[PDB]
Amino acid sequence: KPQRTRMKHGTYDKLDDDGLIAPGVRVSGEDVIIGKTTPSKRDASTPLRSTENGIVDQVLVTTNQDGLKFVKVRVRTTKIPQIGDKFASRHGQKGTIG
């Protein structure tokens, strides 16, 4: 978790100090999902996809066959049928909910 010593707009508020949010945390908008730094410090963190939100589902920490500590954050969202969503019978006509 970096703190201005060029970061991104959405808050870094939700990350733990290892740099990662943790399952259960509700994210949205632009929130920093992954907190990454390059050496004072140029900021290289991963924001959440702008048009989204949900809750963090699993976070996995591991390594590639040599070296790299890497990280994968799964984010859950539920999607309720809604005006403009697409639906089709099994006969090749889609439509959306009007």
Partner: protein, 43 residues
């Protein structure tokens, strides 16, 4: 508790930046849920 569950063997664990990323000796680790406690609207 602390920080990381383990992919297999389910061992609760915590280390930084000692040791390197391991366990069992499995190299896949999961972050535990926050104690933050989430609210749902049940809608």
């Amino acid at each position: 508790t602390l920080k990381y569950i383990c992919a297999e063997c389910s061992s609760k664990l915590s280390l930084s930046r000692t040791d390197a990323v391991r366990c069992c000796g499995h190299r896949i680790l999961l972050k535990a849920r926050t104690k933050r406690l989430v609210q749902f609207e049940a809608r």
